[PDB]
Structure formats: C-alpha cells, structure tokens
C-alpha cells in the first residue's frame, strides 16, 4: 500500500461502527483518477469517527461518511488541495461544496 503525500497525517484511528447514523459527509474529487479503496480508508480513518468511504463506480468522485462533524472538517482542512499517490484531491462538504 502506497502512502506518498505532501501533508503531515495523524495516526490511523478506529472506524465508527458501520451502522452509526451519518453526521457529516464529504465529497472527494480525484484528478486525474481515483485512488484504491484501502488507501482511502487508511487516509480518511486518521481523523477519527469514519463510518465509511466509497467510490462512485467508474467516476472520479468518492464519498466519506463521518460520525463527527469536527473529524470531517479536519479531513477537509488537512487534505483539500494536497497530492496523494500522484493524485490531486479536492475534499469538501457534500451539502455545501466550494
């Protein structure tokens, strides 16, 4: 599993239980192609309270469900605009994209 990034990351945290009701949602937009799912889970669990991350099939869009608003905001502040494994990322609130 590759981790090549230009940002300092927190350690991996445990995911919230899969059935946890969703509190915050993020769009992840990949330029030029999406990243593998295991990489995405490793990266996005690091902010805590990650319920799930998945890709929209065959598209450059992923979706991050968090059990905590502050955690998702941390993921935005840390990852938006950064490069991961050769891919540029946009991370934004799903309900109000920038």
Numbering used by the authors: 369 to 466
Give sentences copied directly from the paper behind this entry:
RBM45 is an RNA-binding protein with roles in neural development by regulating RNA splicing. Its dysfunction and aggregation are associated with neurodegenerative diseases such as amyotrophic lateral sclerosis (ALS) and frontotemporal lobar dementia (FTLD). In this work, we identified that the C-terminal RRM domain of human RBM45 (RBM45RRM3) sequence specifically binds GACG sequence RNA and solved the crystal structures of RBM45RRM3 in apo form and in complex with a single-stranded DNA that mimicked the recognized RNA.
There are four RBM45RRM3 molecules per asymmetry unit, containing residues from Gln370 to Arg466 or Glu467. The last nine residues at the C-terminus, including the NLS, are disordered in all four molecules. RBM45RRM3 bears the canonical RRM fold, which is characterized by a βαββαβ topology. The four β-strands form an antiparallel β–sheet in the order of β4–β1–β3–β2, while the two α-helices are located on the same side of the sheet. The exposed side of the β-sheet is predominantly positively charged, indicating a potential RNA binding surface. The overall structure of RBM45RRM3 can be well aligned with the AlphaFold-predicted model with a Cα root-mean-square deviation (RMSD) of 0.42 Å (for 86 residues). The major differences occur in the N-terminal loop, C-terminal loop, and some other loop regions, and these regions also show diversity among the four molecules in the asymmetric unit. The β2–β3 loop of RRM3 is much shorter than those of RRM1 and RRM2, whereas the α2–β4 loop of RRM3 is a little shorter than that of RRM1 and significantly longer than that of RRM2. The most significant difference is that RRM3 has a distinctive N-terminal loop surrounding α1 and touching α2 as well as the α2–β4 loop.
